[PDB]
Design an enzyme around this catalytic site. Structure first.
Site, PDB file in Angstrom:
ATOM      1  N   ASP A  81       0.828  -1.210   0.000  1.00 23.95           N
ATOM      2  CA  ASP A  81       0.000   0.000   0.000  1.00 23.95           C
ATOM      3  C   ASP A  81       0.865   1.264   0.000  1.00 23.95           C
ATOM      4  OD1 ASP A  81      -2.049   1.785   0.176  1.00 23.95           O
ATOM      5  OD2 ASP A  81      -2.305   1.550   2.354  1.00 23.95           O
TER       6      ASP A  81
ATOM      7  N   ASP B 111      -1.394   5.527  -5.510  1.00 24.85           N
ATOM      8  CA  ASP B 111      -1.809   4.692  -4.372  1.00 24.85           C
ATOM      9  C   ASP B 111      -2.127   3.271  -4.834  1.00 24.85           C
ATOM     10  OD1 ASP B 111      -2.603   3.616  -2.065  1.00 24.85           O
ATOM     11  OD2 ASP B 111      -4.366   4.917  -1.731  1.00 24.85           O
TER      12      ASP B 111
END
Lengths: 4, 324
Positions: free
Chosen positions: B34, B217
Site C-alpha cells: 500500500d 496509491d
C-alpha cells in the site's frame, strides 16, 4: 473498491 | 541488493498482495502492498476478532521478537481499520532481511480484513504518516541498513483479464514489464503520500480536466477523481452517477477512447478495457469514481496500465506504459  | 516479490491479484483487480516472512524462523504473511499508508501491521495471536484463514504472528514463536508495547491504531479511507501494539522483528522482503523492523501486532481488525485475503498491510508511503510518530518504515530501513543501493522499488500490477499477478522489485525495477523509456516525475511528499500533478486529462481530442493533483496509491482499487473531474470524465463516457462514489458505464468498451493524463510532458493512460472495473448482473461499474476528495487517488485502475518506479530518496517516480 479498496481505499487505503 | 534486489528483492523480488511476486504478487497475487485478488479478484477483478481489487488489490495486490505479496508474501513477507516475519520472525525467526519466520512465518509467511500475505500483505496488501500500500503506497497510501505507512504501517506494517499483521494479524496476531493477540487478536480478538481476526479471521480463521489468516496467518497470525505469535511473539513466543519468534527468537528475534523485541517487545515494544506502545499502542497503534489505523483507519483507512474505505472504512476498514486495525489496532493493537507495536513490536520489532526481522522482516524478509523478497530475500532482503530487514533487521528489527517495527511491526504492528493486531489486537483488533475490521470485519472486512477478517473476511478478506490479507494477513495485514505493508505500508509504502512516507514515514511522516506512520500512526505512531517516529516509526521507521520498511523502505526507510532497507535504505538505512544498506540492503538496497538504489532507494527505489519498481511496481508492476497485473490485470485479472491477463491472468493477474504483479511484481514488486525492491532496489531495482523490471524493464520487461514496461514499454519505451521511463519518464521522471517529481513527487510532493508533504502529506505523506506519493503526490503528483496531472497537467491535463483528455478523452480523444476533448479536454476533460485541467490541472489537478493526485496521489499514486497501490492500495486503492479505482481511479478516484475530484467530483468535477469525475463528473466530466463520466460525461465523456456517458456514465451515470450511482450516488455512492461509483458510476455505471456501458460494459462494451469497444467504442471508448483511453483516458489520457498528461504528466510532466508525457502521456499515461487508462486503457479502454480498464474503464470497466466490475460487471454484476449485466451492469458495469466504471474504473473511475469520486469520493469528495480535493485531489485524485490514482489507484489500481491507472497503475495496472502504468509501471511505476518509486524513489523515496529524491523523492520522485518514473512511469512508463505497461507492456500489454
Amino acid at each position: 473498491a479498496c481505499v487505503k | 541488493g534486489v528483492g523480488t516479490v511476486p504478487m497475487t491479484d485478488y479478484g477483478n483487480d481489487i488489490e495486490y498482495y505479496g508474501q513477507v516472512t516475519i520472525g525467526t524462523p519466520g512465518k509467511k504473511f500475505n500483505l496488501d502492498f500500500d503506497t497510501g499508508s505507512s504501517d506494517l501491521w499483521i494479524a496476531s495471536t493477540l487478536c480478538t476478532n481476526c479471521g480463521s484463514r489468516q496467518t497470525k504472528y505469535d511473539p513466543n514463536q519468534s527468537s528475534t521478537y523485541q517487545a515494544d508495547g506502545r499502542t497503534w491504531s489505523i483507519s483507512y479511507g474505505d472504512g476498514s481499520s486495525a489496532s493493537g501494539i507495536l513490536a520489532k522483528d526481522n522482516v524478509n522482503l523478497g530475500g532482503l532481511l530487514i533487521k528489527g523492523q517495527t511491526i504492528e501486532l493486531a489486537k483488533r481488525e475490521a470485519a472486512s480484513f477478517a473476511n478478506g485475503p490479507n494477513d495485514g498491510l505493508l505500508g509504502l508511503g512516507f514515514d511522516t504518516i506512520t500512526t505512531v510518530r517516529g516509526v521507521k518504515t520498511p523502505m526507510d530501513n532497507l535504505i538505512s541498513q544498506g540492503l538496497i543501493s538504489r532507494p527505489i522499488f519498481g511496481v508492476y500490477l497485473g490485470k485479472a483479464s491477463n491472468g493477474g499477478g504483479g511484481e514488486y522489485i525492491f532496489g531495482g525495477y523490471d524493464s520487461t514489464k514496461f514499454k519505451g523509456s521511463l519518464t521522471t516525475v517529481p513527487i510532493d511528499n508533504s502529506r505523506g503520500w506519493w503526490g503528483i500533478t496531472v497537467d491535463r486529462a483528455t478523452v480523444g481530442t476533448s479536454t476533460v480536466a485541467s490541472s489537478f493533483d493526485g496521489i499514486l496509491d497501490t492500495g486503492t482499487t479505482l481511479l478516484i477523481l475530484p467530483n468535477n473531474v469525475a463528473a466530466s470524465v463520466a460525461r465523456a463516457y456517458g456514465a451515470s452517477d450511482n450516488g455512492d462514489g461509483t458510476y455505471t458505464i456501458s460494459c462494451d468498451t469497444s467504442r471508448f477512447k483511453p483516458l489520457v493524463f498528461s504528466i510532466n510532458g508525457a502521456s499515461f493512460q487508462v486503457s479502454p478495457d480498464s474503464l470497466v472495473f466490475e460487471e454484476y448482473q449485466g451492469q458495469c461499474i466504471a474504473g473511475f469514481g469520486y469520493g469528495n476528495f480535493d485531489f485524485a487517488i490514482i489507484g489500481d485502475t491507472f497503475l495496472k496500465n502504468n509501471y511505476v518506479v518509486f524513489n523515496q530518496g529524491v523523492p520522485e517516480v518514473q512511469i512508463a506504459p505497461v507492456a500489454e
